[PDB]
Every structure is written in C-alpha cells, then in structure tokens.
Design a protein around this motif. Structure first.
Motif, PDB file in Angstrom:
ATOM      1  N   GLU A  61     -18.838   0.460 -50.906  1.00 58.76           N
ATOM      2  CA  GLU A  61     -17.517   0.394 -50.775  1.00 58.76           C
ATOM      3  C   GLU A  61     -17.037   1.448 -50.270  1.00 58.76           C
ATOM      4  O   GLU A  61     -17.109   2.642 -50.696  1.00 58.76           O
ATOM      5  N   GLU A  93       0.412   4.226 -48.825  1.00 60.17           N
ATOM      6  CA  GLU A  93       0.395   3.780 -50.195  1.00 60.17           C
ATOM      7  C   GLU A  93       0.617   5.147 -51.046  1.00 60.17           C
ATOM      8  O   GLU A  93       1.098   6.116 -50.276  1.00 60.17           O
ATOM      9  N   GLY A 106      -9.550   0.551 -46.431  1.00 56.84           N
ATOM     10  CA  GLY A 106     -10.822   0.086 -46.969  1.00 56.84           C
ATOM     11  C   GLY A 106     -11.469  -1.112 -46.222  1.00 56.84           C
ATOM     12  O   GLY A 106     -11.140  -2.171 -46.247  1.00 56.84           O
TER      13      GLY A 106
HETATM   14  C1  LIG Z   1      -7.868  -3.520 -56.302  1.00 54.93           C
HETATM   15  C2  LIG Z   1      -6.852  -2.702 -55.592  1.00 54.93           C
HETATM   16  O1  LIG Z   1      -7.036  -1.334 -55.779  1.00 54.93           O
HETATM   17  N1  LIG Z   1      -5.629  -3.295 -55.144  1.00 54.93           N
HETATM   18  C3  LIG Z   1      -4.811  -2.258 -54.536  1.00 54.93           C
HETATM   19  C4  LIG Z   1      -5.158  -2.011 -52.967  1.00 54.93           C
HETATM   20  O2  LIG Z   1      -6.386  -1.193 -52.921  1.00 54.93           O
HETATM   21  C5  LIG Z   1      -7.087  -1.548 -51.447  1.00 54.93           C
HETATM   22  C6  LIG Z   1      -6.250  -0.940 -50.518  1.00 54.93           C
HETATM   23  O3  LIG Z   1      -6.118   0.514 -50.590  1.00 54.93           O
HETATM   24  C7  LIG Z   1      -7.141  -1.119 -49.227  1.00 54.93           C
HETATM   25  C8  LIG Z   1      -6.785  -0.380 -48.127  1.00 54.93           C
HETATM   26  O4  LIG Z   1      -7.151  -0.942 -46.899  1.00 54.93           O
HETATM   27  O5  LIG Z   1      -8.633  -0.813 -49.569  1.00 54.93           O
HETATM   28  C9  LIG Z   1      -9.095  -1.386 -50.728  1.00 54.93           C
HETATM   29  O6  LIG Z   1      -9.492  -2.948 -50.525  1.00 54.93           O
HETATM   30  C10 LIG Z   1     -10.363  -3.376 -49.537  1.00 54.93           C
HETATM   31  C11 LIG Z   1     -10.028  -4.178 -48.368  1.00 54.93           C
HETATM   32  O7  LIG Z   1      -9.016  -3.472 -47.829  1.00 54.93           O
HETATM   33  C12 LIG Z   1      -9.459  -5.318 -49.041  1.00 54.93           C
HETATM   34  O8  LIG Z   1      -9.350  -6.283 -48.161  1.00 54.93           O
HETATM   35  C13 LIG Z   1     -10.444  -5.941 -49.891  1.00 54.93           C
HETATM   36  O9  LIG Z   1      -9.837  -7.050 -50.744  1.00 54.93           O
HETATM   37  C14 LIG Z   1     -10.757  -8.179 -50.889  1.00 54.93           C
HETATM   38  C15 LIG Z   1     -11.369  -8.154 -52.574  1.00 54.93           C
HETATM   39  O10 LIG Z   1     -11.997  -6.877 -52.504  1.00 54.93           O
HETATM   40  C16 LIG Z   1     -12.290  -9.550 -52.676  1.00 54.93           C
HETATM   41  O11 LIG Z   1     -12.427  -9.470 -54.083  1.00 54.93           O
HETATM   42  C17 LIG Z   1     -11.481 -10.557 -52.164  1.00 54.93           C
HETATM   43  O12 LIG Z   1     -11.861 -11.801 -52.584  1.00 54.93           O
HETATM   44  O13 LIG Z   1     -10.907 -10.785 -50.956  1.00 54.93           O
HETATM   45  C18 LIG Z   1      -9.995  -9.354 -50.852  1.00 54.93           C
HETATM   46  C19 LIG Z   1      -9.674  -9.718 -49.159  1.00 54.93           C
HETATM   47  O14 LIG Z   1     -10.596  -9.800 -48.487  1.00 54.93           O
HETATM   48  O15 LIG Z   1     -10.861  -5.158 -51.030  1.00 54.93           O
HETATM   49  C20 LIG Z   1     -11.467  -3.899 -50.468  1.00 54.93           C
HETATM   50  C21 LIG Z   1     -12.142  -3.138 -51.664  1.00 54.93           C
HETATM   51  O16 LIG Z   1     -12.420  -2.000 -51.081  1.00 54.93           O
HETATM   52  C22 LIG Z   1      -8.578  -1.200 -51.844  1.00 54.93           C
HETATM   53  O17 LIG Z   1      -9.293  -1.890 -53.146  1.00 54.93           O
HETATM   54  O18 LIG Z   1      -3.945  -1.241 -52.446  1.00 54.93           O
HETATM   55  C23 LIG Z   1      -2.725  -1.857 -52.790  1.00 54.93           C
HETATM   56  C24 LIG Z   1      -1.770  -1.126 -51.873  1.00 54.93           C
HETATM   57  O19 LIG Z   1      -2.419  -1.066 -50.532  1.00 54.93           O
HETATM   58  C25 LIG Z   1      -2.442  -2.149 -53.995  1.00 54.93           C
HETATM   59  O20 LIG Z   1      -2.257  -1.025 -54.707  1.00 54.93           O
HETATM   60  C26 LIG Z   1      -3.176  -2.885 -54.896  1.00 54.93           C
HETATM   61  O21 LIG Z   1      -3.025  -3.101 -55.804  1.00 54.93           O
HETATM   62  C27 LIG Z   1      -2.704  -4.321 -56.379  1.00 54.93           C
HETATM   63  O22 LIG Z   1      -1.029  -4.637 -55.966  1.00 54.93           O
HETATM   64  C28 LIG Z   1      -0.570  -5.824 -56.328  1.00 54.93           C
HETATM   65  C29 LIG Z   1       0.656  -6.429 -55.717  1.00 54.93           C
HETATM   66  O23 LIG Z   1       1.548  -5.171 -55.310  1.00 54.93           O
HETATM   67  C30 LIG Z   1      -0.301  -5.551 -57.823  1.00 54.93           C
HETATM   68  O24 LIG Z   1       0.450  -4.306 -57.888  1.00 54.93           O
HETATM   69  C31 LIG Z   1      -1.600  -5.522 -58.444  1.00 54.93           C
HETATM   70  O25 LIG Z   1      -1.155  -5.420 -59.805  1.00 54.93           O
HETATM   71  C32 LIG Z   1      -2.612  -4.539 -57.780  1.00 54.93           C
HETATM   72  O26 LIG Z   1      -3.949  -4.739 -58.356  1.00 54.93           O
END
Ligand SMILES: CC(=O)N[C@H]1[C@H](O[C@H]2[C@@H](O)[C@@H](CO)O[C@H](O[C@@H]3[C@H](O)[C@@H](O)[C@H](O[C@H]4[C@H](O)[C@@H](O)[C@H](O)O[C@@H]4CO)O[C@@H]3CO)[C@@H]2O)O[C@H](CO)[C@H](O)[C@@H]1O[C@@H]1O[C@H](CO)[C@H](O)[C@H](O)[C@H]1O
Length: 197
Positions: A61, A93, A106
């Motif tokens: 990752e 963020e 990410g």
């Molecule tokens: C899980 C997490 O930390 N979520 C928060 C999010 O973190 C991500 C961001 O910093 C991005 C920045 O580009 O990087 C990381 O995510 C990357 C990639 O960018 C995503 O597209 C990908 O997502 C995937 C997922 O992993 C798969 O499981 C899924 O099937 O498909 C998706 C889409 O392709 O994940 C990778 C993992 O490296 C990083 O994890 O940052 C957000 C702000 O930018 C939020 O903080 C987010 O947290 C969520 O926010 C929501 C709604 O606002 C709620 O607060 C939730 O409670 C919370 O988890």
C-alpha cells in the motif's frame, strides 16, 4: 502471524517560482512540483521481516504525502497566508489543523508482490523514487499592513512516499497526521515576487 512494515521516504528538493509583479490586493501563486529523486527514510514502524528474498508474497500500500504550512512568517513578524489554488488529484485532509496542510495520494493498495526487497529500511537510508504526482498550486494572501518591494521567501515543507508492506490482503495503514506534522521538512520553495501599492 500478521505483520506490517511502514517506511516513510522523504524527498529533499530545492525549487523557486517567480510570482511576478503584484499589487497587494492580488494573490500571487506558486507551483510546487514533484520531482522524482533520491529520498531518505525519516520514519518507520515495523514488526515483520526486513528482507523479502523472492520466495514469498507480501502486499503493497503506497501513499504519497505533502505537508505544507498554512502560514509563513517574515523575519520582522508579518504573516503570509498560504491558500490552495489547485491541488489536482491530491486529497486534502485533516483540514482542522491549525498549522499545516496535509495532502495525500493513495495510489497502490492490495497489490501482491514477490519482488525481492528491503521491507524496513532504517532512518537515514536512501532509495530512488521514480513516481510522479500532480503539481500543487498555492496562492498567497498579502497583508494590507505588510510593506512593499521585492520579496524572497524560503518555505520548507515535507514530501515523500509512505510504503506499507504487509503479510495480508486488505492491509491498510496511514501515517498519523501528528507524526506526518513533525517529519523533517526537506523540501524548499523559494517564492519570489515584487510588491506595489
Ligand atoms: C479507509 C480510510 O482511511 N478512509 C479515509 C481515506 O483514506 C484514504 C485517503 O487518504 C486516500 C488518499 O488518496 O488514500 C488511501 O486510500 C487509497 C485510495 O486512494 C482509495 O481509492 C482506495 O479505496 C479503495 C478501497 O481501498 C477498496 O477497499 C475499495 O473496494 O475500493 C476503494 C476505491 O477504489 O483505498 C486506498 C487504500 O490505500 C487512504 O486509505 O481518507 C478520507 C479523506 O480523504 C477519509 O478520511 C476516509 O475515511 C472515511 O471517511 C468517511 C466519510 O467521510 C467516514 O468518515 C468513514 O467513517 C471513514 O473511514
């Protein structure tokens, strides 16, 4: 048994940008660019194998970071406010932080690999980072009470890549923002502009 290694590779780059002649009601801009280069480990957290020999799977990752100040003080005690103009695909963020912008990209997750690799390089170790990310364009709000003429402002900031290697699929880890806030700021933007009435 499960393990996660996370290593932050910090880029140190020096750049300048000419924000041209401005009156004090205009917001001059500057563009920070991501220049592939040699990075240095400034932080890690590891509890897994330090070396992948090729025989076994691990999962990647990767998340790029920029931590950038929101305000830059002059040596006389005047503030310059740093504003986002265009951050491309960067994720902005932890927006409630007093002091610092946090931009994340990410770009790689869940990615299985067998490639031989050093999975927990130690601080001060270096590697070449080939990846390229979007420019970020900032604008600067100049103070009315601020004085005139040519200005040259050094702005330190952090950029680099977090590489997280894990034993399992679905592994997720983000460097805490409080940790990212205090990483070494190895980049420099020298911002130039000429001020007027
Ligand atoms: C899980 C997490 O930390 N979520 C928060 C999010 O973190 C991500 C961001 O910093 C991005 C920045 O580009 O990087 C990381 O995510 C990357 C990639 O960018 C995503 O597209 C990908 O997502 C995937 C997922 O992993 C798969 O499981 C899924 O099937 O498909 C998706 C889409 O392709 O994940 C990778 C993992 O490296 C990083 O994890 O940052 C957000 C702000 O930018 C939020 O903080 C987010 O947290 C969520 O926010 C929501 C709604 O606002 C709620 O607060 C939730 O409670 C919370 O988890």
């Amino acid at each position: 048994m499960a393990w996660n290694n996370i290593v932050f590779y910090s880029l140190g780059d020096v750049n300048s940008y000419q924000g041209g002649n401005v009156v004090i009601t205009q917001r001059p801009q500057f563009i920070t660019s991501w220049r592939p280069g040699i990075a240095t480990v400034t932080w890690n957290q590891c509890n897994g194998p330090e070396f992948a020999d090729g025989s076994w799977a691990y999962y990647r990752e990767y998340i790029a970071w920029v931590v950038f100040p929101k305000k830059v003080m002059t040596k006389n005690g005047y503030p310059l406010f740093i504003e986002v103009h265009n951050k491309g695909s960067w994720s902005e963020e932890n927006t409630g932080d007093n002091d610092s912008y946090f931009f994340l990209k990410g770009y790689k997750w869940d990615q299985r690999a067998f490639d031989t690799a050093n999975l927990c390089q130690k601080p001060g170790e270096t590697t070449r980072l080939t990846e390229k990310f979007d420019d970020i364009i900032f604008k600067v709000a100049l103070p009315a009470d601020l004085p005139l003429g040519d200005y040259s402002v050094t702005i330190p900031y952090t950029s680099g890549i977090q590489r997280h290697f894990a034993s399992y699929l679905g592994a997720r880890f983000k460097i805490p923002y409080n940790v990212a806030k205090t990483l070494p700021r190895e980049n420099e933007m020298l911002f130039l502009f000429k001020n007027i009435g």
